[PDB]
Design a protein around this ligand. Structure first.
Ligand SMILES: CC(=O)N[C@@H]1[C@@H](O)[C@@H](O)[C@@H](CO)O[C@@H]1O
Ligand SMILES: CC(=O)N[C@@H]1[C@@H](O)[C@@H](O)[C@@H](CO)O[C@@H]1O
Ligand SMILES: CC(=O)N[C@@H]1[C@@H](O)[C@@H](O)[C@@H](CO)O[C@@H]1O
Lengths: 141, 141
């Protein structure tokens, strides 16, 4: 099995985001999201699956942060500027169906950042990027 | 918009279930899960969508509880005996794809109960079952 422990950092008091969805994809015997010590913990049955966290702010901004294991290495991706019909479960499935999202996963990134239309930065960084017990920060700008 | 507030009652100390997944379907401008006063609150952009909570126990038992609004009337369903590849996002989608799940939604039930293979009962009952501010109890046997 693989475990990914996520710590969320909010750095900019001009907005406040909260988690509104937590999904788990069906490959590699699936998995489970839980919370321990204010950390989001994803456990997976093997290499080849993932889970998505969707966040929303009161001002309308939202994004997905997805974490998983591809070919025995960690991966991550962030999607911003979400339409109302782009929920976390939609985004999670797209990593296994939609070519551009598939490629984002196959890159096996231990770090990724991107801005939304308003210019806000979002970053995922793995502070423990090796082995089966993986650790990442999600930093909101 | 519609809101469904869910209260979880675990009545049997021979096991402990916890939420491991919360999904939101893409119709009716989607929506959001949040937590207020230890309650799971699903907000939806209108009539015509739903969200799924998946629970897992340490003994291997698991189930999904799905809540939504269909043509302005609330609905619910429970699926038990989940395989490893039947995650919450898989089940949530099946209510708009698969015949027996679709029919469950169309029944617009204000209460439903079912047993798993081990004989444990699970029930959903809406205690506020009309209007836009709906309240439901999820009762684990
Ligand atoms: C060992 C491993 O990572 N296997 C995965 C598989 O489970 C699946 O995610 C696929 C993409 O659909 O890529 C790889 O074959
Ligand atoms: C601005 C934005 O959200 N860009 C995302 C990018 O971060 C990446 O996730 C890609 C593949 O999924 O899709 C979108 O282009
Ligand atoms: C107003 C309303 O509830 N409309 C829904 C629609 O959104 C969709 O969920 C469909 C399911 O196939 O059923 C109803 O037509």
């Amino acid at each position: 099995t693989y475990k990914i422990t996520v710590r969320v950092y909010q750095t900019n008091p001009n907005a406040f985001f909260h988690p509104v969805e937590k999904t788990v994809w069906k490959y590699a015997n699936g998995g489970t999201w839980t919370i321990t010590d204010d950390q989001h913990v994803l456990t997976m049955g093997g290499s080849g699956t993932s889970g998505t966290l969707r966040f929303h702010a009161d001002n309308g901004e939202s994004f997905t942060a997805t974490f998983g294991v591809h070919n025995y290495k960690r991966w991550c991706d962030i999607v911003t500027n979400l339409a109302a019909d782009e929920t976390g479960m939609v985004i999670n499935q797209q990593y296994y169906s939609q070519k551009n999202r598939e490629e984002a996963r196959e890159r096996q990134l231990s770090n990724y950042e991107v801005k939304n239309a308003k210019g806000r930065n979002f970053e995922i960084v793995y502070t423990e990027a090796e082995g089966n017990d993986l650790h990442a920060n999600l930093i909101i700008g």
